[PDB]
Amino acid sequence: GQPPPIQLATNYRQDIDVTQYYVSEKLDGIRAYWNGHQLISKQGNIFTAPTWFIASFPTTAMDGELWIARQQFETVSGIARTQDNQNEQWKQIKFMIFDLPKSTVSFEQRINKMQTLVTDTNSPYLQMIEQQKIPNTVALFDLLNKVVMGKGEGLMLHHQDALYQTKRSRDLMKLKKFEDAEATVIAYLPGKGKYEGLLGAILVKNEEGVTFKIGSGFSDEERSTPPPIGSLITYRFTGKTNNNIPRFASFVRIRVIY
Ligand SMILES: *P(=O)(O)OC[C@H]1O[C@@H](n2cnc3c(N)ncnc32)[C@H](O)[C@@H]1O
Instruction: Give 76's DSSP letter.
Output: H
Cα separation, 206 vs 63, in Å, equals 34
- φ, ψ of residue 118 to 5 degrees: the values are -65, -45
- Which has the closest alpha carbon to 152: 237, 67, 23, 25? 25
Residues within a 6 A CB radius of ligand 1: 9, 24-27, 31, 65, 98, 129, 156, 174
- Whether the CB-CB separation of 114 and 97 falls below 8 Å is answered with yes
Cβ neighbour number for residue 190 with a 10 Å cutoff: 11
Q: How far apart are CA 24 and CA 2, in angstroms?
A: 28
Taking residue 133's Cβ as centre, other Cβ atoms within 10 Å add up to 11
**Residue in 101, 4, 121, 99 with CA at minimum distance from that of residue 55:** 121
Q: Which of 115, 98, 135 is nearest to 20 (CA)?
A: 135
Burial of residue 4, with CB atoms counted within 10 A of its CB: 0-12 exposed, 13-18 middle, 19 or more buried: buried
Residue 145, H or E segment: helix 137-149
Strands of the sheet containing 8-11, edge to edge, are 8-11, 168-175, 154-159, 21-26
Spatial distance between the Cα atoms of 140 and 17, rounded to a whole number of angstroms: 12
Element (H, E) at 11: strand 8-11
Question: What approach was used to elucidate this structure?
Answer: X-ray
Q: Which residues of 75-98 are buried (b: 16+ CB within 10 A; e: fewer)?
A: ebeebbeeeeeeeeebeebbbbbb
Q: Resolution reached, in Å?
A: 1.6
At the topology level, CATH places domain 1-28+130-177 in Dna Ligase; domain 1 (3.30.1490)
Close Cβ partners of 81 (under 8 Å, ≥ 6 residues apart): none
Q: Output Rg (C-alpha) for the chain, integer angstroms.
A: 22
Helix H or strand E encompassing 211:
strand 211-214
CATH 3.30.470.30 boundaries in the chain: 29-129
CA-proximal residue: ligand 1, atom 19 (nearest):
9
Ligand 1 center to 6 CA (angstroms): 12
Name the segment(s) of the chain with CATH classification 3.30.1490.70. Answer: 1-28+130-177
Looking at 26, 113, 167, 174, which residue is catalytic?
Answer: 26
- Residue 53: which H helix or E strand, with range? helix 51-54
Amino acid at residue number 172? L
Superfamily of domain 29-129, CATH level 4: DNA ligase/mRNA capping enzyme (3.30.470.30)
Residue minimizing CA distance to atom 5 of ligand 1: 26
Is position 26 annotated as part of the catalytic site? yes
- Give ∠ CA 177-178-184 in degrees, rounded to 5: 170
**CA of 61 relative to ligand 1 center, distance in Å:** 17
